[PDB]
Amino acid sequence: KIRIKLRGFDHKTLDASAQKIVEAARRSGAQVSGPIPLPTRVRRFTVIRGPFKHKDSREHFELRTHNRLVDIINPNRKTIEQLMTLDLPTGVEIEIKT
């Protein structure tokens, strides 16, 4: 019952990263619940364009923290092999709690 959470910033980076876990998990493991989206949490920033004083300016910035999940039930010592040190994404953070 390996719970795999995938939090990131780029949705393609995670898609792949997430797919990479989907692939080598069915080859050595068993029955995977597939990759699931959350939600996704945004961090808006309402700043004034000009540095001087023009309230009516304002540029709008966001920051999307995408969340992906992949569940693996019936965790074998063989599954943990492919999914041991066979990663590649950089702007992706993973944490496991089983």
Partner 1 sequence: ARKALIEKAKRTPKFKVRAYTRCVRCGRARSVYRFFGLCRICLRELAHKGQLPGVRKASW
Partner 2 sequence: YYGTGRRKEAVARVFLRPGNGKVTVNGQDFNEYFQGLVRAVAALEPLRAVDALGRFDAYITVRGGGKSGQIDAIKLGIARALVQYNPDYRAKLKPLGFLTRDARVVERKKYGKHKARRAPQYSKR
Partner 3 sequence: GNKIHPIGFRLGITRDWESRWYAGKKQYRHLLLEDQRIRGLLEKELYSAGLARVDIERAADNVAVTVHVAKPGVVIGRGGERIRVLREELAKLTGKNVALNVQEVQNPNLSAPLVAQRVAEQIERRFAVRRAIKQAVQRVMESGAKGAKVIVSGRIGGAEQARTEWAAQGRVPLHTLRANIDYGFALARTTYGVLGVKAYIFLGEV
Considering only residues 9 through 68, tell me which ones interact with partner 1, judged by CB under 8 A.
9-10, 43-45, 47-49, 51, 59-65
Per CB under 8 A, the list member of 12, 55, 77, 97 interacting with partner 2 is 55
92 binds, among partner 3, partner 2, RNA, none (CB under 5 to 8 A by kind): partner 3
Least distance CB 56 / partner 1 (angstroms): 15
9 binds, among RNA, partner 1, partner 2, none (CB under 5 to 8 A by kind): partner 1
Long-range CB pairs of 27-32, under 8 A, 24+ apart, other chains included: 27/82, 28/76, 28/78, 28/79, 28/81, 28/82, 29/72, 29/74, 29/75, 29/76, 29/78, 29/79, 30/73, 30/74, 30/76, 30/79, 31/73, 31/74, 32/70, 32/71, 32/72, 32/73
